[PDB]
């Protein structure tokens, strides 16, 4: 199912949805995969998250050009870390409109990230204010509350079985929540569960650092987080 294109991998998850994967070789630690989404919505493409770098993100745009050959209307990035926002200059250079959580844009400079052009805001229930996310088509953006970071956001694809937890969700076989450095350990469990409740029909859970999984990834992540609080 995987298609390789330079140093990147693309996996088709639905007729109009692909997972993009980029790698960062870290000496000793080895290659670290980060996943995002590419969505074909009629006559345009929507991207969720950049690659680790500008160069890798340019290759995502080249692949879309080659395999889909539609313009990229917009990209949404799911928090102010390198794996999700490392490639913002490459999207900008391409004249792609970028959206992030207002708080992601606010944290970006301290994190060494370039801010998105536009800020998303959320209701108290976690759902994006539609006026901040115009023409998002099937992208349903949900802020589940603090977990991996204070700014972490999530994306469901309307009319598919796919919801994207980004770095908030770990796979159902994960031994731990990984590094708990920039994390809200108190609210993590509830944030995991809010993601679950926001996209109840999603049977395929896509995440940053594991292969697509079942809803068991949400319940496992929440149950690991329970043992922190």
């Amino acid at each position: 199912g995987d298609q390789r294109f330079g140093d990147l991998v693309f996996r088709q998850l639905a007729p109009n949805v692909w997972q993009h994967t980029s790698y960062l070789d870290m000496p000793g630690f080895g290659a670290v995969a980060s996943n995002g989404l590419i969505v074909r919505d009629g006559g345009r493409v929507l991207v969720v998250d950049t690659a680790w770098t500008d160069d890798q993100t340019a290759q995502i745009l080249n692949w879309i050009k080659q395999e889909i050959n539609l313009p990229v209307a917009l990209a949404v990035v799911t928090h102010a870390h390198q794996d999700k926002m490392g490639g913002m200059d490459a999207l900008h250079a391409a004249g792609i409109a970028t959206y992030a959580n207002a708080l992601s844009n606010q944290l970006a400079p301290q994190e060494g990230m370039v801010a998105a052009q536009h800020s998303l805001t959320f209701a108290a229930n976690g759902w994006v204010e539609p006026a901040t996310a115009p023409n998002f088509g099937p992208l349903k953006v949900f802020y589940p509350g603090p977990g991996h970071t204070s700014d972490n956001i999530t994306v469901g694809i309307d009319g598919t079985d796919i919801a994207f937890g980004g770095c908030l969700i770990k796979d159902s076989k994960a031994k731990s929540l990984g590094n708990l450095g920039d994390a809200d350990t108190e609210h993590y469990a509830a944030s995991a569960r809010a993601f679950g409740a926001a996209f109840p029909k999603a049977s395929m859970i896509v995440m940053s650092h594991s292969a697509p999984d079942s809803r068991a990834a949400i319940t496992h992540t929440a149950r690991m987080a329970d043992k922190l609080r």
């Binding site: 960062l24 870290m26 670290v32 390198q82 060494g112 590094n179 450095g181 650092h209």
Partner: peptide, 8 residues
């Protein structure tokens, strides 16, 4: 370095 899961 803030390389996602890798804290350096």
């Amino acid at each position: 370095x803030x390389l996602x899961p890798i804290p350096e």
